[PDB]
């Protein structure tokens with residue numbers, strides 16, 4: 036049955052959503068009943084509800100994706116697998132996204148961001164930030180996932196992913212003239228492309244032309260579980276498809292918005308500049324940014340977090356009750372759906388005083404003063420974001436090189452709105468800015 040799916044969809048595109056939950060909390064409370072995407076759903080608002088859903092994976096709940104997302108991502112990815120297979124895939128992914136592993140890719144990421152800024156920003160009087168950020172974010176994935184530096188090949192894959200992403204928000208009608216149908220065709224083309232990259236990679240590894248750690252493709256190809264089993268081609272394809280979905284639209288949001296919010300709060304921009312320039316003062320010219328420099332960008336990371344609080348790229352996500360669960364006096368029946376949202380804590384004065392104000396100081400001392408399960412841009416528990424530290428690296432390096440290159444900037448439209456009907460919140464006009472390069 037339609038249930039409340041239509042009203043929820045209406046509120047989502049309306050870019051409100053907070054109200055959708057607010058009025059249901061006002062009428063029923065934090066733990067209330069609803070029907071979404073044809074399933075009986077219970078929304079658990081607030082920190083206590085967040086802990087229930089997020090911290091009890093495989094105990095009381097399991098990740099549940101809607102049918103259409105399963106068809107576009109595949110059934111063999113880390114996001115669509117459960118139980119033991121999920122834990123193995125996270126272990127394989129940790130070989131690239133883990134803190135020790137991520138440090139070996141900072142050089143490649145730094146170089147691309149540096150080259151992108153110099154080529155497409157440094158010499159312009161004005162730029163439209165959003166398309167540049169999208170290009171940079173995708174190209175970093177192409178380099179770090181597949182070692183693809185060829186610009187035409189990067190653009191080809193970039194266009195293909197855009198077509199697939201259209202279907203994830205269209206009506207799931209697999210018919211010749213619908214958006215979902217074209218997305219499914221795009222996924223088929225991408226699968227064939229990635230299959231050829233897998234084959235050539237297997238050869239390149241056997242002939243000593245590629246290493247086991249150079250990129251994500253090699254890490255996943257060389258992974259073996261505790262019993263010596265490698266991942267299958269379908270598992271590698273679906274994981275790459277899922278990782279492209281997860282990485283492109285999400286990271287684009289804070290990167291595109293960070294300098295919009297900073298332009299409205301110049302005192303915070305002043306502190307970002309001072310932090311970044313102080314880091315450069317202690318380096319010789321030509322010396323590359325290091326992982327140690329990265330960890331010194333504390334205030335910059337506080338600005339990024341406050342951007343994520345006010346404009347979460349992922350409003351929330353769904354689980355399925357794998358057992359009858361007793362919560363707040365009620366019993367969520369097995370087979371029912373559960374939903375948590377950042378909108379129950381992120382915009383609330385109760386958890387973040389003056390929530391409408393941009394205050395990076397909320398995350399002072401590495402977030403010491405943030406209450407548990409109130410700031411959740413990357414979720415939590417066994418299903419927490421695989422790539423959050425990858426995103427953090429991109430944002431910090433991007434901010435660093437921008438501040439290094441430019442003395443100042445000025446928004447062309449200071450009153451530009453920040454909407455997103457599709458999940459990703461972004462500058463409504465792409466955030467055009469005038470640029471002032473350092474002399």
Ligand code: HEM
Nearest residue numbers: 114281282285286348349352412413414418420421422426
């Ligand atoms: C850029 C690289 C990124 C990669 C490779 C990535 C990858 C992933 C993957 C594979 C998962 C599923 C983990 C699992 O099922 O075990 C996940 C979860 C998640 N991601 Fe990310 N992600 C990235 C960036 C981001 C960003 C920037 C945000 C938001 C600021 C974000 C928000 C989330 C959230 C909230 C979840 C958990 C959803 C839930 O538990 O219901 N991701 N990510």
